[PDB]
Design an enzyme around this catalytic site. Structure first.
Site, PDB file in Angstrom:
ATOM      1  N   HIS A 184       0.858  -1.173   0.000  1.00  0.00           N
ATOM      2  CA  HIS A 184       0.000   0.000   0.000  1.00  0.00           C
ATOM      3  C   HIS A 184       0.896   1.225   0.000  1.00  0.00           C
ATOM      4  CE1 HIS A 184      -3.964  -1.735   0.252  1.00  0.00           C
ATOM      5  NE2 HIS A 184      -3.613  -2.497   1.272  1.00  0.00           N
ATOM      6  N   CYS A 226       0.220   2.994  -4.540  1.00  0.00           N
ATOM      7  CA  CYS A 226      -0.453   4.243  -4.861  1.00  0.00           C
ATOM      8  C   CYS A 226       0.438   5.411  -4.461  1.00  0.00           C
ATOM      9  CB  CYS A 226      -1.811   4.325  -4.161  1.00  0.00           C
ATOM     10  SG  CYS A 226      -2.986   3.058  -4.697  1.00  0.00           S
TER      11      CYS A 226
END
Lengths: 231, 5
Positions: A88, A130
């Site tokens: 993440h 991301c």
């Protein structure tokens, strides 16, 4: 003369950090599909000639320690170095299972003034994560920072898509292109074809119109001083 | 489920 020297005993070390499960305090769900990605990556980069090691669900201190020790090893007989981050992420930052750590702090260990055995050699960083919260709607002496290359899954600020069944877009595209042309193309040609593939072949599907028919474009940051072939 | 990172 205009290419990186690949005349070594080993191609180099490839560290793959596969973070799938996260502590409850981070509030992030399981990254389903990342094992497919990590396996595919392991095979592609093994095929290239790397010595690949896969670490799973690492903490920030663990990632830092890992890249630190790697930076402190002897790469005298190594042509290059590669690190892949599967986790993440937010802008300029990536998630361990405990929390977040700055990417620049991960890559700084391999700076010219800190990792002398990788001096004048390419240091490759592939980051599937991301880099923000924004969405693409689409339309129809030598410097210490030199010889670095960052292959990000997406541009700064935007999302990086990952299909739980098929894996993340960037990684699967990258793996396909590496399967086919990994040894007869220069790294920038490869990553450009990856850009093309991720950009065109993919369009997200979701019941929420907010995430329906959305797009993604990868980002390549090059500080390389020569052309790079894996042969 | 069916979504990002």
């Amino acid at each position: 003369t205009y290419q990186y020297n690949m005349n070594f005993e080993k191609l180099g070390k490839c560290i793959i950090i596969n973070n799938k499960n996260f502590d409850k305090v981070t509030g992030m769900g399981v990254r389903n599909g990342t094992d497919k990605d990590a396996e595919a990556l392991f095979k592609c980069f093994r095929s290239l000639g790397f010595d690949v090691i896969v670490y799973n669900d690492c903490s920030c201190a663990k990632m830092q320690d890992l890249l630190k020790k790697a930076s402190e090893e002897d790469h005298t007989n190594a042509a290059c170095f590669a690190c892949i981050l599967l986790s993440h992420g937010e802008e300029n930052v990536i998630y361990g299972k405990d929390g977040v750590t700055p990417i620049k702090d991960l890559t700084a260990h391999f700076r010219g003034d800190r990792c002398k055995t990788l001096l004048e050699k390419p240091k490759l960083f592939f980051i599937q994560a991301c880099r923000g919260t924004e969405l693409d709607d689409g339309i129809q002496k030598i410097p210490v920072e030199a010889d670095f290359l960052f292959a990000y899954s997406t541009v700064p600020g935007y999302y990086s898509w990952r299909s739980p069944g098929r894996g993340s877009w960037f990684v699967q595209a990258l793996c396909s292109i590496l399967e086919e042309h990994g040894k007869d193309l220069e790294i920038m040609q490869i990553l450009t074809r990856v850009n093309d593939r991720v950009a065109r072949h993919f369009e997200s599907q979701s019941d929420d119109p907010h995430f329906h028919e959305k797009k993604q474009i990868p980002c390549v940051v090059s500080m390389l001083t020569k052309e790079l072939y894996f042969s | 489920x069916d979504x990002x990172x």
